[PDB]
Write a protein that binds this ligand. Structure first.
Ligand SMILES: Nc1ncnc2c1ncn2[C@@H]1O[C@H](COP(=O)(O)OP(=O)(O)NP(=O)(O)O)[C@@H](O)[C@H]1O
Ligand SMILES: [Mg+2]
Ligand SMILES: [Mg+2]
Length: 299
């Protein structure tokens, strides 16, 4: 850290204690976050930020460099052919993909499946020139359980069928049981901590994303405070997916908020499931049919 213009040994200690350990968190910080450190004047705060930006090289980019930026994105297989396809390859990192369906349409199932697929090295698609094996080594997932529907059996099961060790998934998956929007949001914010503890967090799950809010703010008259709270949570989720190049997933049950990829899932006949991609930045709307069996998502 002392590499940063103005930053010395003492200051370095302050910054590391306030959460700012790496450059990108400093290069993308606001002169406010940093000054609120006390001892970190608005003067030095601007200087270290101008600097951290430079080192990380956050300027204007054009031509072929734009493709280089877009290749730092890796994807995760959902274990469905039609779904990965509709996904344009699979679940993207640096973005928040949301599955919003009806009761028992499969949201939680897709969530579990992903935790498992993360421990299957072959299920992460990327360009090795922009994303080295080391970056995706010992990936771990954080599962913020809102409804209390995390089921370790179901993990073990999906693993066994995938041909991998379920105990290995359980060992690399952090589950946090949230009972309300405060715990939910906080757990989310506390993820940056597991990463500084040396945890290669690459998958984040919020099941559900919109449950606690609806319950805490049913009053459709105090909607403001709510939508603010929820939107601020999303901002954290996105920033989190960008800076730590990791896939973030959220579920939303339905019979407004930011989410870079929007899916609407519904039950079919029996196993059959219909996932409808109605919103995304570069892909056309489309439907993906898959199913859920003892093996998880398949076809
Ligand atoms: N071990 C299993 N073997 C076969 N099917 C299973 C298994 N576990 C769960 N399912 C299927 O998963 C369905 C439930 O899907 P689920 O992931 O709970 O949807 P959901 O989006 O979470 N619904 P909700 O939480 O109520 O909003 C069941 O009704 C089963 O068909
Ligand atoms: Mg993004
Ligand atoms: Mg659910």
């Amino acid at each position: 850290l002392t590499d940063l213009p103005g930053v010395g040994p003492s200051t370095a200690e302050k910054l590391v204690e306030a959460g700012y350990i790496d450059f990108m968190k400093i290069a993308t910080a606001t002169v406010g976050e940093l000054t609120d450190i006390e001892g970190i004047s608005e003067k030095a705060a601007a200087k270290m930020i101008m600097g951290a930006r430079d080192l990380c090289d956050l300027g204007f980019k054009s031509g072929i460099d734009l493709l280089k930026q877009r290749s730092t994105v890796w994807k995760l297989s959902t274990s469905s052919s039609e779904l990965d396809s509709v996904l344009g390859g699979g679940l993207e990192s640096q973005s928040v993909t949301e599955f919003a369906g009806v009761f028992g349409s499969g949201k939680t199932q897709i969530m579990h499946q992903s935790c498992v697929n993360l421990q299957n090295p072959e299920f992460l698609f990327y360009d090795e020139e922009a994303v080295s094996k080391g970056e995706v080594a010992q990936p771990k997932a954080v599962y913020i359980d809102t409804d209390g529907t995390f089921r370790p059996e179901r993990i073990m099961q999906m693993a066994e069928h995938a041909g991998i060790d379920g105990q290995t998934v359980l060992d690399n998956t952090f589950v946090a049981r949230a009972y309300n929007s405060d715990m939910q949001m906080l757990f989310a914010e506390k993820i940056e901590d597991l990463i500084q503890e040396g945890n290669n967090i690459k998958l984040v799950v919020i099941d559900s994303l919109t449950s606690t809010f609806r319950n805490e703010y049913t009053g459709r008259g105090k909607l403001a405070e709510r939508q603010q709270k929820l939107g601020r949570h999303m901002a954290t989720l996105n920033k989190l997916a960008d800076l730590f190049n990791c896939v973030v997933l959220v579920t939303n049950q339905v019979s407004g908020h930011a989410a870079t990829f929007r899916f609407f899932v519904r039950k079919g006949k029996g196993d059959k499931r219909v996932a409808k991609l109605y919103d995304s930045p570069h892909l056309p709307d489309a439907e993906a049919i898959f199913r859920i069996t003892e093996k998880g998502i398949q076809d």
